[PDB]
Design a binder for this molecule. Structure first.
Ligand code: SRM
Ligand code: SF4
Ligand SMILES: [Cl-]
Ligand SMILES: [Cl-]
Ligand SMILES: [K+]
Length: 538
């Protein structure tokens, strides 16, 4: 690779970072949008105030403002549901480590409550909140209300650093390696400029996923993140080995690979900045399917990429990876659903199943009430779109288990429901080929009626090849497709994936059977469970 390839392609201009004029040839349309107007101005120069006052019908009549609502608003966490819910916006937060409060939960519920049938909320596969039904005129007030309860929505979509994922058992688990909350909190604060906005990292070639590991279980899925911090001692010091470039896409899925780098714990933010700077500065900005960070690593090679990170470290040192990390390979992923003792004596946490991550405002108020009456006001989200309420005096558990709402959000659902994960699908997502959430519930219920099992089989349903519900990590994955019934009529289908493994011995699953009509999935899945996962016909 030439020395010329290493020339930074972006420059700071008026507090923002923009593509240098020599590197603007052949860029994709999204890069054009970013050049035409810096998205961060909608927040940092309060451009949202004036945009929000324009009727949508009129917004749609010019390119600049249509690009504002359909693309630039994703820098403010706002996603126009143009096809399936015209004029309404899904809104996505930053929620490092999945940690929320009862007050935050009540505030979000109060927002969606206003929108009635157009509102609801969802836990995401990055242990994050999404809310729905938002109208543009309400945006200025919602942004103020979020700030008031200590939330931000900044930089949560498009070409930005996504929600920092950590250990859902951080601080409470007797077996944790290192509490991940301080580090995911620092990362989020760094990425969003302490909720003011951070333009140094808001103009990447593409989305970029971080996680910090603190569990032997690897609840954080480090193998599928752009940057994963793996806890490791080096020369007597606590820190992290770094894995880089994991990603899923319609074209390619790849697991993260060692950068061959270790940082002390205090260097978590400096190396996150160095890697993002290298990615921002040097990454390809053509075909969107070749813009993820792994593609840069493949072009430069891991050593060439590593050198770029190294020059962007303070004092310009990057130590080599330590031989062995702290994650024990001898480990069985623990079920966190149900009631479990904390490391603080006399306290328990409870894991509650949220069916396919979907909640309404009344449900959110109930969960917030439980967290206040039984816990410490804290609610934790998980990447299986479930919840944990920590910090419950164990003497209160008898009473808690009698709460009516626990019959809906159960601490002990059937085993197949425990592991069930589903993306938004075509109820709201315009890219979706099929309906996912209702369908996956109905199918899973009918399957579980027919078989009993002991192994915790994880089933993931995703509505299109973007694979937001990560079908490549599942024991059985279902990817939306259109197919044909026996009479040649169009019907919703799934491509069925097998082979996905998580934890230290991770593996990416692959298509096993294409184009299965959804209405035929029950018998197929019953047989797979009996033949491959030890299930027993009832
Ligand atoms: C909500 C969520 C799925 C869920 O039900 O849980 C989601 C939903 C969306 N994803 Fe995703 N993705 C979500 C996690 C994922 C993950 C899983 C992960 O992060 O571990 C992946 C695969 C992992 C990865 O990216 O490496 C992912 C892969 C993407 C892709 C393909 C990325 C690529 O490189 O090609 C897109 C399309 C794109 O960015 O070009 C997509 C884009 C979309 C959009 C924004 C599509 C569009 O705008 O309509 C979806 C919004 C639908 C809606 O209204 O909810 N989403 N998305 C997740 C929100 C996570 C969060 O809180 O930040
Ligand atoms: S996998 Fe496809 S259908 Fe599901 S939320 Fe992602 S983009 Fe939408
Ligand atoms: Cl996006
Ligand atoms: Cl859409
Ligand atoms: K769930």
């Amino acid at each position: 690779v030439a020395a010329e390839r290493l020339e930074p392609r972006v420059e700071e201009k008026d507090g923002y970072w923009i593509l240098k004029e020599q590197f603007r040839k052949g860029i994709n349309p999204q890069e054009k949008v970013k050049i035409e107007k810096e998205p961060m101005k909608l927040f940092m120069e309060n451009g949202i105030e004036e945009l929000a006052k324009i009727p949508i019908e009129e917004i749609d009549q010019s390119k600049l403002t249509k690009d504002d609502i359909d693309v630039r608003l994703k820098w403010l966490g706002l996603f126009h549901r143009r096809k399936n819910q015209y004029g309404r916006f899904m809104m996505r937060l930053k929620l490092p480590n999945g940690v929320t409060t009862s007050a935050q939960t009540r505030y979000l519920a109060s927002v969606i409550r206003k929108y009635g049938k157009e509102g609801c909320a969802d836990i995401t596969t990055r242990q994050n909140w999404q809310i729905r039904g938002v109208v543009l005129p309400d945006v200025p007030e919602i942004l103020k209300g979020l700030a008031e309860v200590g939330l931000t929505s900044l930089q949560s979509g498009m070409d930005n650093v996504r929600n920092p994922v950590g250990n859902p058992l951080a601080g409470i688990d007797p077996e944790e390696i290192v509490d991940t909350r301080p580090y995911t909190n620092l990362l989020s604060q760094f990425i969003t400029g302490n909720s003011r906005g951070n333009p140094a990292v808001s103009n990447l070639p593409r989305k970029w996923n971080p996680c910090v590991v603190g569990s032997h279980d690897l609840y954080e899925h480090p193998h599928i993140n752009d940057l994963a911090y793996m806890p490791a001692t080096k020369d007597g010091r606590f820190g992290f080995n770094l894995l880089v470039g994991g990603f899923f896409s319609a074209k390619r899925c790849d697991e993260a690979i060692p950068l061959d780098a270790w940082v002390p714990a205090d260097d978590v933010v400096p190396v996150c900045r160095a890697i993002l700077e290298a990615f921002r500065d040097l990454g390809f900005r053509g075909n969107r399917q070749k813009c993820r960070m792994m593609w840069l690593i493949d072009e430069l090679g891991v050593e060439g990429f590593r050198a770029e990170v190294e020059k962007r470290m303070p004092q310009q040192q990057l130590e080599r990876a330590s031989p062995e990390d702290l994650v024990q390979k001898q480990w069985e992923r623990r079920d966190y659903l149900g009631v479990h003792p904390q490391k603080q004596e006399g306290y328990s946490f409870i894991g509650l199943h949220i069916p396919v991550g979907r909640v309404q405002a009344d449900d959110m108020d109930e969960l917030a009430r439980l967290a206040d009456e039984y816990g410490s006001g804290e609610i934790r989200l998980t990447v299986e779109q479930n919840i944990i309420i920590p910090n419950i005096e164990t003497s209160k558990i008898e009473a808690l288990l009698k709460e009516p709402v626990l019959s809906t959000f159960s601490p002990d659902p059937p085993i197949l429901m425990k592991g069930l994960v589903a993306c938004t699908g075509n109820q709201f997502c315009g890219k979706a080929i099929i309906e996912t959430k209702a369908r996956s519930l109905k199918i899973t219920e009918e399957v579980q009626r027919q078989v009993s099992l002991t192994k915790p089989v994880r089933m993931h349903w995703t509505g299109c090849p973007n694979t937001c519900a990560q079908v490549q990590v599942a024991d059985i994955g279902f990817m939306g497709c259109l197919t044909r019934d026996k009479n040649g009529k169009t019907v919703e289908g799934a491509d069925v994936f097998l082979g996905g493994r998580i934890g230290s011995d991770s593996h990416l699953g692959e298509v096993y059977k294409k184009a299965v009509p959804c209405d035929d999935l029950v018998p197929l899945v019953v047989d797979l469970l009996v033949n491959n996962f030890g299930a027993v016909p009832r």
